[PDB]
């Protein structure tokens, strides 16, 4: 079954580690669809940034793709 919908007010009520977990559980599968091997690394990189921006990325496929693309470029240069 699908994970539940995440809103700003819901996210805001949770402890800091829990907010990152809420965001990560939703980001990971979408990122993994794009980059099966780097998914874990990409997701951890993205979780470094602000939760309200991460929530926006979850609400806008275009926004998530753009961020993923930058993270991959960075990882590929390092590897």
């Amino acid at each position: 079954g699908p994970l539940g919908s995440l809103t700003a007010s819901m996210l805001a009520s949770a402890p800091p580690q829990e907010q990152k977990q809420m965001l990560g559980e939703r980001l990971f599968p979408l990122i993994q669809a794009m980059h099966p091997t780097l998914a874990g690394k990409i997701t951890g990189m993205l979780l470094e940034i602000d939760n309200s921006e991460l929530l926006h990325m979850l609400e806008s496929p275009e926004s998530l793709r753009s961020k993923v693309d930058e993270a991959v470029a960075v990882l590929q240069a390092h590897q």
Binding site: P16, Q17, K20, Q21, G24, E25, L27, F28, P29, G40, K41, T43, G44, M45, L47, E48
Partner: peptide
């Protein structure tokens, strides 16, 4: 450089 995220495992990047 940040810890990888693994579904269903507590992320160690902030805890």
């Amino acid at each position: 450089w940040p810890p990888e995220f693994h579904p269903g495992v507590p992320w160690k990047g902030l805890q």
